[PDB]
A = this chain, B = another copy of it.
Amino acid sequence: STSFWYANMDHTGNARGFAPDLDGDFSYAVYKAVAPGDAAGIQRAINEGTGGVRRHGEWLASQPRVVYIPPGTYTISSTIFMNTDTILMGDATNPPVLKAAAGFSGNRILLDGRDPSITDGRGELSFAVGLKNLILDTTNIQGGQEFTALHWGVAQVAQLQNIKIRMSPSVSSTGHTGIRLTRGSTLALADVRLERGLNGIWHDGHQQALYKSIYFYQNTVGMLITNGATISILAPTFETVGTGVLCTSGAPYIGLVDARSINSGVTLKTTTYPSFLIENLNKDAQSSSNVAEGPSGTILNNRAHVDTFTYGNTVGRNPVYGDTYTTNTRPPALAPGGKYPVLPAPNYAANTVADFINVKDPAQNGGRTVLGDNTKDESKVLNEILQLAASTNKIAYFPFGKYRVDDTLLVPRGSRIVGEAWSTITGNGDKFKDESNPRPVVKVGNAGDVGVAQISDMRITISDVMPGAILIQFNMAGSNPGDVALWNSLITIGGTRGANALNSKCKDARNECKAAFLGMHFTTSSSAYVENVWNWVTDHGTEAYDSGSNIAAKGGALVESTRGTWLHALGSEHYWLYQLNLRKASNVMISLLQSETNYDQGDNVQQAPPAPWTPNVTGWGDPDFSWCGPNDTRCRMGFSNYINGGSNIYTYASASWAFFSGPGYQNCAGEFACQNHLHWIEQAPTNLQAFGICGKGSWAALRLAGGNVITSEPDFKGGWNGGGGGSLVGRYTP
């Protein structure tokens, strides 16, 4: 066929992806190839399993399927339905066209990312749906009819990579929609080009999403926002677009940062009362329309350049809801050239198999035997292959598997790592059980390293209760932002097969297991780029087994870097003390942080935090909760944002939700009574620019360093459920 690197990798033989924990099935095919032009074969490859048994729906990581679609045109006559943990991989050298037929029958959706096996449309459970190197075409459908090329009501670990959507020109209240997001909890939509139609993206009640580097080309409306909580749009381009962003319902947060307007109309228009920010908008001469318009008329007139304009709930303003214009000079290390760094996930479209090292092939990795079946320690053998590929400038390809490591797996300078449907590194052993000497499972460079370390399509996890485990630690800094990067990956604790020892020790809410020390760590001399990454302590089982979810992992993400750190849609959920900790960091940019308090915590918790952990304030910057009464359990809940000093902190959207008050999915007292403090500033940083700090079920919308509290009600409401339990700090620029 072609020379596309993935299709030419060994998918038979010993170097193929191998799936353990499949109930004795050692013949399951991770890889399937569709015949050229075989449109019916796309759905077949998605669902087909071993010996005629259909694949499991709703599973997260153990039964992955990558469907290779060769170049060509595939005429689609009815909706194609994805499965969880499934990737459609078109040929990157010549992406295939999935074209809707003229006689398209059924629901007017070309591709549905939501697994049909989920009941009651729970998109927040449709994890790990991937689309790569595809062209969606609906030009055979009349532009006046309602149609949706892609329904993206999905959850985390879902990804878009090198996707193009051609639609018919709009006519009419109905028309083509490129990507419609209904119920779901996804993280990032990256590098999608939407051509024509009525709506390029329709955000219909999706909780939150970061839209990174989206190209809106000749859309009647760039993004339609009907309902939803937190919307972050980073580095978009509006070319011949009638209206950039149109929000006709709800009170969400809308973040438009580093936007470009090419011969377009109004950039942000709303008929309701959302809180939005426009930072670094650059308009051309043909874009002569107002920048912002609302129910009362013009909000911001025609300006070719906008610095920092908010219109929403702002701290210190009389009245709270209103306009504010400021100018801020971004640090050149954070924003080279005034623009924050945005990079597409690598697809290696021009690379062939020779540019890679298949870690399992003895002819490629230096004559080493690698299993990836979670039956033995493979740390040393994998540290040697990773150092070999970096020293020879080869990309290290991990076929799918579960690679058990009993010591740190170092990612050395010059590494480019890519996996097959989130190949899994799992830590194990006594070397990660010393909480007095915490140890990284995956270490990205040594202390003081400068170089390239790019990782994509991987998973890191643990197999036992390991109170000293740091799942990934970033030590290396890049020469340019993105040299050290992590794309489209997940870091999980529990919830998946392959961790029996961990699964047996975490079934008691009275003694929550000390599974890990940290999920992610960014050391002081590091400089890392993170996009579409799920940092998740399990709340429920995903792969049909008694999963146990009473886990006390101390901290989710600890950022100590003073060089520069960019977090594009990082989901950090269900850790004990905090989801995001900024400990004396000095150059941090956050385009979206998605977080959720641990479900076992709240008024009816059985073990009050910080227990079972003893906080180390001096050594690791833990919150000690010494301000709460020893039995004030609404006060002793994990923080979503714990900002502790430092400088040059830019956060542009925080989707932090509280749902329950204790084990068993117990309800909270009220809409704003699940938690007291989700967002907490311990020490005021120098040059802090915070926008879109959203919450759910929190009494306070933000806590300031001196102890002052910004209450969610009555004037800092918004976002989740339009304010029915939702917090919104649209502007905090102290």
* A interface residue numbers (CB < 8 A to B): 43-44, 47, 53-54, 78, 81, 105-108, 116-123, 145, 153, 182-183, 204-205, 665-667, 669-671, 721, 724-725
Contact = CB atoms under 8 A, between A and B. Distances in A.
A183 B44 contact: no
B119 A204 contact: yes
Nearest to A173: B544
A675 B53 CA distance: 50
Q: How many copies does the complex hold?
A: 2
B183 A119 contact: yes
A78 B47 CA distance: 14
B119 A43 contact: no
Contacts of A54: 108, 145
A121 B115 CA distance: 12
Contacts of A118: 121
A122 B121 contact: yes
A183 B81 contact: no
Contacts of A123: 120
B120 A153 contact: yes
Nearest to A114: B121
Contacts of A721: 667
Contacts of A53: 145
Contacts of A669: 670
A546 to B, nearest CB: 14
A39 B673 CA distance: 54
Q: Which of A120, A123, A725 has the most CB of B within 10 A?
A: A120
Nearest to A57: B107
Given A44-B105, A669-B670, A119 B182 contact: yes
B105 A43 contact: yes
Contacts of A724: 665-667
Contact of A182 (B106, B116, B120): B120
A727 B47 CA distance: 42
Contacts of A671: 667
Contacts of A47: 105-106
A671 B204 CA distance: 27
Given A122-B121, A669-B670, A724-B667, A116 B105 contact: no
Contact of A107 (B105, B117, B145, B204): B117
Contacts of A670: 667, 669-670
A270 to B, nearest CB: 19
A122 B106 CA distance: 19
Contacts of A117: 107
A561 to B, nearest CB: 39
B121 A119 contact: yes
Nearest to A48: B105
9 contacts: A43-B106, A119-B153, A119-B204, A120-B183, A121-B122, A121-B183, A666-B724, A667-B670, A667-B724
Contacts of A105: 43-44, 47
A706 B40 CA distance: 69
B205 A119 contact: yes
A658 to B, nearest CB: 14
Contacts of A107: 81, 116-117
Contacts of A667: 670-671, 721, 724-725
A145 B53 CA distance: 8
Given A54-B145, A120-B153, 18 more contacts: A43-B105, A54-B108, A78-B78, A81-B107, A107-B116, A107-B117, A119-B121, A119-B153, A119-B182, A119-B183, A119-B204, A120-B183, A120-B205, A666-B724, A667-B724, A667-B725, A669-B670, A670-B670
Nearest to A53: B145
Nearest to A672: B667
Nearest to A544: B173
A721 B664 CA distance: 11
Contacts of A122: 121
A39 to B, nearest CB: 13
A725 B670 CA distance: 13
A344 to B, nearest CB: 30
A122 B182 CA distance: 12
Contacts of A108: 54
Nearest to A105: B43
A183 B120 CA distance: 6
Contact of A116 (B106, B205, B665): B106
A117 B121 CA distance: 12
A271 to B, nearest CB: 15
A122 B121 CA distance: 7
A145 B56 CA distance: 12
Q: Which of A81, A121, A183, A671 has the most CB of B within 10 A?
A: A121
Contacts of A183: 119-121
A44 B153 CA distance: 26
A205 B120 CA distance: 9
Contacts of A81: 106-107
Which 8 pairs of residues, A with B, have the shortest CB-CB distance?
A121-B121, A120-B183, A120-B121, A107-B116, A119-B182, A667-B671, A667-B724, A120-B182
Q: Which of A106, A665, A725 has the most CB of B within 10 A?
A: A106
A547 to B, nearest CB: 16
A671 B123 CA distance: 25
A115 to B, nearest CB: 9
Contacts of A182: 119-120
A138 to B, nearest CB: 15
A121 B119 CA distance: 7
Contacts of A106: 43, 47, 81, 116
A475 to B, nearest CB: 43
A667 B54 CA distance: 42
A118 B114 CA distance: 14
A670 B725 CA distance: 13
A730 B120 CA distance: 28
A65 to B, nearest CB: 15
Q: Which of A78, A145, A665, A667 has the most CB of B within 10 A?
A: A667
A438 B105 CA distance: 50
A360 B664 CA distance: 59
A183 to B, nearest CB: 4
A721 B153 CA distance: 25
Contacts of A43: 105-106
A76 to B, nearest CB: 14
Nearest to A182: B119
Nearest to A121: B121
A591 B210 CA distance: 51
Nearest to A79: B116
A47 B108 CA distance: 11
Contacts of A78: 78
A123 B666 CA distance: 24
A119 B202 CA distance: 13
